[PDB]
Amino acid sequence: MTEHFITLSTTEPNNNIGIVKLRHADVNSQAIVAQIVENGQPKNFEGLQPFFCLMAQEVSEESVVSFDAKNGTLKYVASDNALQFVGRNEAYFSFRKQEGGRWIEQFSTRTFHYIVEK
């Protein structure tokens, strides 16, 4: 399949990132490879689980399968939900830990945009 590499910040805006262009009815897998950054340097998210939070336009949460918490990297495979809106999509990554039998966000990235083409 295809991969899309971008660097996402928790402190700074994510409007300057590389343009991610996904395909709506793709036969093969499509993934967003993200470098988590805090003040322009990698963010350790050891003991935390990343979540793909797609925003509803005028919300969809999915657990990210592959990640290197130490190097601050993650690989999210675009779901059918993430590819549904043909056009400009807005999403963010939330890092959570389990306590009380439910996930609790310790911190998150700032919103970024990706384009689903057809």
Question: Can you characterise this structure?
Answer:
The chain contains one helix and eleven strands; from the N terminus they run E-E-E-E-E-E-E-E-H-E-E-E. The protein has 118 residues and is mostly beta strands. The protein has one domain: Immunoglobulin-like, CATH 2.60.40.3350. It is globular. It starts with a strand and ends with a strand. The PDB classes it as viral protein. The entry lists the keywords all beta protein, immunoglobulin fold, structural protein, TP901-1 ORF46 and ORF49, phage baseplate, viral protein.
Q: How many β-strand stretches?
A: 11
Number of helices: 1
**Could you state the order of secondary-structure elements as H and E?**
EEEEEEEEHEEE
Shape: globular
CATH architecture: Sandwich
User: What is the name of the CATH topology?
Assistant: Immunoglobulin-like
Helix proportion range: under 10%
Kindly estimate the percentage of residues that lie in beta strands according to DSSP: over 45%
Report the end-to-end length measured between terminal Cα atoms.
17 Å
Organism: Lactococcus phage TP901-1
Protein name: ORF48
PDB class: viral protein
Keywords: all beta protein, immunoglobulin fold, structural protein, TP901-1 ORF46 and ORF49, viral protein
